[PDB]
Design a protein around this nucleic acid. Sequence first.
RNA 1: GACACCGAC
DNA 2: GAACAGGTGTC
Length: 131
Amino acid sequence: IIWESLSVDVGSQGNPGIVEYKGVDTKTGEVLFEREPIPIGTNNMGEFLAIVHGLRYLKERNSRKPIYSNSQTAIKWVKDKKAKSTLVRNEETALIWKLVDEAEEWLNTHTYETPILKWQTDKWGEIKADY
RNA sequence: GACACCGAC
DNA sequence: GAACAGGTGTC
Ligand SMILES: [Cl-]
Ligand code: NA
C-alpha cells in the first residue's frame, strides 16, 4: 500500500440511483472532499467522477500523490478519457451525464502525472473511501 | 463465463 | 456487527 495517497469511492442508494462520492487521505481516513448527491447515476459513473475530481483536487494543490480507486471500470474510462456508460440519456439522467461529459472535457484539456492505482480489495480489505 | 464494483439474527 | 436478488462494467 502506498499510504501517501488519496483514496476515492462512490456511494449510492440504488444502482442506478442516487450517487455521491468522496475522497479521503488513505493513511488517516480524513475526508478531503465529498460531492453532493446526484439524483440518478450509476456506480461506475460515480467512480469515474470521483477519480477525475481527485485529479483536479491534487493538481490544484500541486500534489504528486497517487489516487487509489477500487474500480477497474472507472480506471479504464479515465485512461481512455471516455466513460462508456450504458445509462440512458433522459431528463432524469441529464445531470450526471453533464458532469460526466464535463469530466471528460477536463481530461481532454489538462495534463497530469498522477498515478491512478487499483485498490486491491481482495488483499487489503475495503478501500478507505468506502461508504 | 471470469473478474472488478455498486436493495432487501 | 453477521447470515437472497438485483444492476453496472471489463476481459
Ligand atoms: Cl492531477
Ligand atoms: Na474496496
